[PDB]
Amino acid sequence: PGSAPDFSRNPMKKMVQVQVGSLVILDCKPRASPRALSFWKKGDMMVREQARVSFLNDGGLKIMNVTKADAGTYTCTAENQFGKANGTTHLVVTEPTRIILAPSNMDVAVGESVILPCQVQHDPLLDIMFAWYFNGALTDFKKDGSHFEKVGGSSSGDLMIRNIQLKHSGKYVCMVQTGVDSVSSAAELIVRGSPGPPENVKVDEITDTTAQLSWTEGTDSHSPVISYAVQARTPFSVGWQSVRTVPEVIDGKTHTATVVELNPWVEYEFRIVASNKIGGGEPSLPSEKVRTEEAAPEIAPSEVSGGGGSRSELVITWDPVPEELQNGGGFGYVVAFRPLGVTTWIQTVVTSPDNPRYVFRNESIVPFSPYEVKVGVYNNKGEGPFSPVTTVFSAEEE
């Protein structure tokens, strides 16, 4: 044996970083036969045993509740019969990283855009790494792009959630790493939406003007249903349009209703829209296409008139009855006329409604004479009313 102190087997760390208020122990274990005595200096100055400072059996230095004042250069000088040796450690005391603006806990509707901040104050000697966790899993959110953006620049970890969806509900955790040190703060986002589309839309008890609708409630968007509304589509409707129901307003607990004021002999599809306090929901898939029962026509034509024409003519004219008021197939008109004073009607059936105009021409038609005229309606299911009688004059031409 016999050898001076030798730090090559057990060198003192070049540099040690500790958080303010932490505990630090600088090692000083050289190899030497016999064992070497040690002492510590901070810079030029000998370390004095003190309140938070003490000399350990293994030649180490223990400092408690470190301040930035304790930072500096500590050297350990060991001496043997055969010489002295020195080792140096630089103590860096750094402030804690602290999160200054953190995610808020939120209850928010789908489609909204929110910002979960994560600003930190940190000691400038250090570098920081931001990380987000979603329901406990590390993520940078880039696989769900178009819903997430990291905003604020390289110094910030702020997270923007765009057009938030139900699947984005959960615990969010912003974590800031600094070397081996770490702070984080968590918040919970609960997301609520419009109800899901109602399902299983069913139509029964079809009449000429009514139908019973039934349906089952759609997916829970985490806010209860307060209301149901009904829409319908026909060849005549400009897309989907609201329909009147009985009850006038349908409860969130009411899954059946009567549609009213439909037109007879029209084709219909129905859908249902659920609402909650968050907003109006996605419409159901449409019901089967059904047709209402046909019925006798009930509306006679308006503005029956006429007059003029060439020799021996009686011209009769009226307003067409709109298709949706025809109530059934094979709709047509019935023109009835008679000389004023005469009681027997002559009538003809007008099979095609295409042109609401009828001309009688023969020698029995007396020039410029008063005729009583009425026009009625019928379809495959029955006869409808006649218009009020009016007076039109035969042609004046002879």
Residues 6+ apart with CB under 8 A from 155: none
84, 139: one domain: no
Closest CA to 271 of 245, 297, 233, 303: 233
- Residues 315-335: b if buried by 16+ CB within 10 A, e if exposed: bbbbeebeeebbbbeebbbbb
Domain-ending residue, one of 144, 166, 192:
192
284, 321: one domain: no
- Alpha-carbon gap, residue 32 to 36, rounded angstroms: 6
Tally Cβ neighbours within 10 Å of residue 232.
Answer: 21
One-letter identity of residue 331? F
Structure tokens at 159: 């997270």
- In Å, what is the CA distance from 80 to each residue of 30, 38, 340? 11, 9, 149
Closest CA to 374 of 346, 398, 342, 353: 346
Closest CA to 134 of 159, 170, 184, 187: 170
Let me know: does 97 contact 121? Beta carbons within 8 Å. Answer: yes
Domain-ending residue, one of 53, 70, 95:
95
Let me know: does 115 contact 150? Beta carbons within 8 Å. Answer: no
Structure tokens at 161: 């959630």
140, 173: one domain: yes
SS3 of residue 323 by DSSP: helix
Let me know: does 20 contact 64? Beta carbons within 8 Å. Answer: no
Q: What is the largest CA-CA distance in the chain?
A: 156
* Count of domains forming the chain: 4
Strand arrangement, sheet containing 211-216: 199-204, 211-216, 256-260, 244-246
202, 281: one domain: yes
- How distant is the alpha carbon of residue 294 from its chain centre? 42
Closest CA to 222 of 285, 166, 154, 267: 166
Let me know: does 3 contact 30? Beta carbons within 8 Å. Answer: no
- Residues 121-147: b if buried by 16+ CB within 10 A, e if exposed: ebbeeeebebbbbbeeeeeebeeeeee
Mode of pairing for the β-strands spanning 181-192 and 106-109: parallel
Number of H-type helices and E-type strands within the chain? 0, 38
Structure tokens at 188: 């919970």
Domain-ending residue, one of 163, 192, 221:
192
SS3 of residue 69 by DSSP: helix
**Running DSSP on this structure, what letter comes out for residue 324?**
G
297, 398: one domain: yes
**Running DSSP on this structure, what letter comes out for residue 322?**
P
One-letter identity of residue 165? Q
173, 74: one domain: no
SS3 of residue 276 by DSSP: strand
Let me know: does 307 contact 318? Beta carbons within 8 Å. Answer: no
Closest CA to 353 of 334, 374, 366: 334
Let me know: does 147 contact 112? Beta carbons within 8 Å. Answer: no
Which CATH number fits the domain that encloses residue 260?
2.60.40.10
Residue 56, φ and ψ in degrees, nearest 5? -85, 160
282, 200: one domain: yes
- The experimental technique behind this entry is X-ray
65, 102: one domain: no
120, 85: one domain: no
Looking at the chain, how many residues does it have? 398
SS3 of residue 166 by DSSP: helix
* HSE-up of residue 3 (Cα within 13 Å, Cβ side): 8
**Running DSSP on this structure, what letter comes out for residue 136?**
T
228, 251: one domain: yes
One-letter identity of residue 382? G
Residue 287: give the domain boundaries.
193-292
304, 397: one domain: yes
**Running DSSP on this structure, what letter comes out for residue 395?**
P
Structure tokens at 281: 């929901």
- Alpha-carbon gap, residue 379 to 223, rounded angstroms: 50
300, 351: one domain: yes
